[PDB]
Design an enzyme around this catalytic site. Structure first.
Site, PDB file in Angstrom:
ATOM      1  N   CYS A 286       2.939   2.079   9.393  1.00  0.00           N
ATOM      2  CA  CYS A 286       3.019   0.827   8.579  1.00  0.00           C
ATOM      3  C   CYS A 286       4.417   0.441   8.196  1.00  0.00           C
ATOM      4  O   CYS A 286       5.478   1.106   8.070  1.00  0.00           O
ATOM      5  CB  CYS A 286       2.194   1.254   7.429  1.00  0.00           C
TER       6      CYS A 286
ATOM      7  N   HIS B 281       0.795  -1.065  -0.124  1.00  0.00           N
ATOM      8  CA  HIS B 281       0.006  -0.004  -0.074  1.00  0.00           C
ATOM      9  C   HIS B 281       0.615   1.304   0.039  1.00  0.00           C
ATOM     10  O   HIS B 281       0.231   2.296  -0.064  1.00  0.00           O
ATOM     11  CB  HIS B 281      -0.971  -0.073   1.126  1.00  0.00           C
TER      12      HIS B 281
ATOM     13  N   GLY C 288       1.856   6.241   9.405  1.00  0.00           N
ATOM     14  CA  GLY C 288       3.279   6.330   9.493  1.00  0.00           C
ATOM     15  C   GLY C 288       4.008   5.329   9.964  1.00  0.00           C
ATOM     16  O   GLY C 288       5.326   4.984   9.495  1.00  0.00           O
TER      17      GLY C 288
HETATM   18  C1  LIG Z   1      -1.270   4.196   1.580  1.00  0.00           C
HETATM   19  N1  LIG Z   1      -1.901   4.903   2.512  1.00  0.00           N
HETATM   20  C2  LIG Z   1      -1.981   6.407   2.235  1.00  0.00           C
HETATM   21  C3  LIG Z   1      -2.710   4.511   3.462  1.00  0.00           C
HETATM   22  C4  LIG Z   1      -3.599   5.334   4.256  1.00  0.00           C
HETATM   23  C5  LIG Z   1      -4.390   4.860   4.976  1.00  0.00           C
HETATM   24  C6  LIG Z   1      -4.333   3.135   5.512  1.00  0.00           C
HETATM   25  N2  LIG Z   1      -5.083   2.780   6.605  1.00  0.00           N
HETATM   26  C7  LIG Z   1      -6.654   2.742   6.373  1.00  0.00           C
HETATM   27  C8  LIG Z   1      -7.235   1.391   6.227  1.00  0.00           C
HETATM   28  C9  LIG Z   1      -7.747   0.612   7.053  1.00  0.00           C
HETATM   29  C10 LIG Z   1      -8.174  -0.716   6.776  1.00  0.00           C
HETATM   30  C11 LIG Z   1      -7.754  -1.138   5.456  1.00  0.00           C
HETATM   31  C12 LIG Z   1      -7.253  -0.542   4.385  1.00  0.00           C
HETATM   32  C13 LIG Z   1      -6.834   0.775   5.017  1.00  0.00           C
HETATM   33  C14 LIG Z   1      -4.460   2.282   7.927  1.00  0.00           C
HETATM   34  O1  LIG Z   1      -5.101   1.785   8.567  1.00  0.00           O
HETATM   35  C15 LIG Z   1      -2.872   2.662   7.990  1.00  0.00           C
HETATM   36  N3  LIG Z   1      -2.874   2.473   9.391  1.00  0.00           N
HETATM   37  N4  LIG Z   1      -2.432   1.673   9.916  1.00  0.00           N
HETATM   38  N5  LIG Z   1      -2.163   1.524  11.393  1.00  0.00           N
HETATM   39  C16 LIG Z   1      -2.449   2.903  11.528  1.00  0.00           C
HETATM   40  C17 LIG Z   1      -2.905   3.700  12.603  1.00  0.00           C
HETATM   41  C18 LIG Z   1      -3.468   4.858  12.722  1.00  0.00           C
HETATM   42  C19 LIG Z   1      -3.865   5.569  11.337  1.00  0.00           C
HETATM   43  C20 LIG Z   1      -3.613   4.671  10.365  1.00  0.00           C
HETATM   44  C21 LIG Z   1      -3.067   3.581  10.327  1.00  0.00           C
HETATM   45  C22 LIG Z   1      -3.352   2.505   4.872  1.00  0.00           C
HETATM   46  C23 LIG Z   1      -2.546   3.090   3.858  1.00  0.00           C
END
Ligand SMILES: CN(C)c1ccc(N(Cc2ccccc2)C(=O)Cn2nnc3ccccc32)cc1
Ligand SMILES: CN(C)c1ccc(N(Cc2ccccc2)C(=O)Cn2nnc3ccccc32)cc1
Lengths: 304, 304
Positions: B145, B41, B143
């Site tokens: 990830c 991602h 951030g």
């Molecule tokens: C590529 N980018 C811009 C991206 C943008 C958002 C995300 N998501 C959303 C999401 C949820 C569930 C399924 C697919 C996506 C995440 O949940 C990523 N993430 N991981 N741990 C986290 C803790 C706090 C906040 C965000 C967090 C992943 C990727």
């Protein structure tokens, strides 16, 4: 989201751990620059610990009696000195892995990470706090002495603790890196019992703020209180008095959540009086006090 | 004595963390040998996450669009490939800090240490467990990830997890290092709700053994039970069924304490039925399940 009992990354401290042997006693030492710090009780046998005269015992020791091993290689001891309850062993090689460092004496309520070591080798890392009775509730076995407690500010490690003993009640006592014990403890196997282990109120409030930031809000009530009214209840539950200094320290968390510090105090008052009723807060069934307001901000902002 | 939620020393893993940027997305990568592993991602914008077609999105990316930075120095990407939900970025330099390593897929109930990172920089280390519903209860912000979960056996790091997402309920989902998600989770921002988060029974029993080893014995009763009778009660409390395999795994702890596994089961049965009554076990007011029998033996023996 999520809130864990998080320790600092330990690599910087792992690169400082060495094994110190004197006679039949083997423990850990911290190697910074060309000095290895370790508990002075390395010169003692288990029998000496009953009534040790460290100055006298140290007279029978020479530089060659302190075996310092960093990994699988021996370090040459070229000097030794006792500073309070620690020994400073001067070696002929500066630790090439020495990080930027400070020696700090922490106050009760302050948290730090411990890197538990055996034979100069790291076994694990956990977070703990200097209790208001100057003990720490760590995880230490025989051989763990000389393991250190620290905090990290970007690239500078502030060493604040070195492990020396375990009291009969299973709690731990040690010194700062100048060899001065926290609290009234001494490196003598005599009657030493800890005082009241009160709860670090400002830390509980910081952790209640972390709970709100991370979505656990069930304990928020419709009430407020005063510092004096709160303290009347806190005294009753063996909680440290909350001061205006603590209120000021919680200012940023109060701003982030929009919950006035005294409103969180009233919520904490109801939790003490009514209990949890079988509910949890951030996966805990008790009020956690080993997170400072600074730790809460740090973990909730992702400081590296 | 003392029993803490202890993580593995993180130095070996800190030496592998790098920053990966693709477009406007910045996250962490794990650099082992001449390959950097990161969540696929990284090629997505927040808008893409609703319905991403990773193969199609990846066609628009070339080696030069993956910015890999180790510390303050840039790594040259000479190849890239998608393996399930991770990207493998081949770099022209092997990581000089690569420890001995394995990629392992853990089972629910197994514990590991997470080194939470932001911009390729370690912020903290905590211990967690693969839940029976294939989520983890971590501490991750935007951030984080690409942060990894691991176990260490002396000098070999077994990487078992890489962080990918946070579900609406604040729980976390990710993959092993071959890019296969734990459980049914997908890297799509769609309706994904976790199943029942049952309690890891064998882990609770191991932690009750750790309590006895460390002096907390108040919960030991005069009773015993059978695997079937215990499981009738455990099902009722959303505890995983205890198998003869689990009884066998607890054999060494049963031997060390002299408490038969089924006697500890009966004690656990009374704790579930009667509650704690305002008492604690190893400083906890609930039954801890994120310590395996192996972790208990490890911490109680001081394995380095
Ligand atoms: C590529 N980018 C811009 C991206 C943008 C958002 C995300 N998501 C959303 C999401 C949820 C569930 C399924 C697919 C996506 C995440 O949940 C990523 N993430 N991981 N741990 C986290 C803790 C706090 C906040 C965000 C967090 C992943 C990727
Ligand atoms: C020098 N040698 C042989 C030595 C031998 C024993 C000790 N003591 C006894 C003691 C208690 C209180 C006050 C003075 C001594 C320790 O408590 C050392 N210690 N530290 N954490 C421990 C955890 C489990 C077991 C032992 C542990 C210190 C030094």
């Amino acid at each position: 989201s999520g809130f864990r009992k998080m320790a600092f990354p330990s690599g910087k401290v792992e690169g400082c751990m060495v094994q110190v042997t004197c006679g039949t006693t083997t423990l850990n030492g911290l190697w910074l620059d060309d000095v290895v710090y370790c508990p002075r009780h390395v010169i003692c046998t288990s029998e000496d610990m009953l009534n040790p005269n460290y100055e006298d015992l140290l007279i029978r020791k020479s530089n060659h009696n302190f075996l310092v091993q960093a990994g699988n290689v021996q370090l040459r001891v070229i000097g030794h000195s006792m500073q309070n309850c620690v020994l400073k062993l001067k070696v002929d090689t500066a630790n090439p892995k020495t990080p930027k460092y400070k020696f700090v004496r922490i106050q009760p309520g302050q948290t730090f990470s411990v890197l538990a070591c055996y034979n100069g080798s790291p076994s694990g890392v956990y977070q703990c706090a200097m209790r208001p009775n100057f003990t720490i509730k760590g995880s230490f076995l025989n051989g763990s002495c000389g393991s250190v407690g620290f905090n990290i500010d970007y690239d500078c490690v502030s060493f604040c603790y070195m492990h020396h003993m375990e009291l009969p009640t299973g709690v731990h006592a040690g010194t700062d890196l100048e060899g001065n014990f926290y609290g009234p403890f001494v490196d003598r196997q005599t009657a030493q019992a800890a005082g009241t282990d009160t709860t670090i109120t400002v830390n509980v409030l910081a952790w209640l703020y972390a709970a709100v930031i991370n979505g656990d809000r069930w304990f928020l009530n419709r009430f407020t209180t005063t510092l004096n009214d709160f303290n009347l209840v806190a005294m009753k539950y063996n909680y440290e008095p909350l001061t205006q200094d603590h209120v000021d320290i919680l200012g940023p968390l109060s701003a982030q959540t929009g919950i006035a510090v005294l409103d969180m105090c009233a919520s904490l008052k109801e939790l003490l009086q009514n209990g949890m009723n079988g509910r949890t807060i951030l996966g805990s069934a008790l009020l956690e006090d080993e997170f400072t307001p600074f730790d809460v901000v740090r973990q909730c902002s992702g400081v590296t």
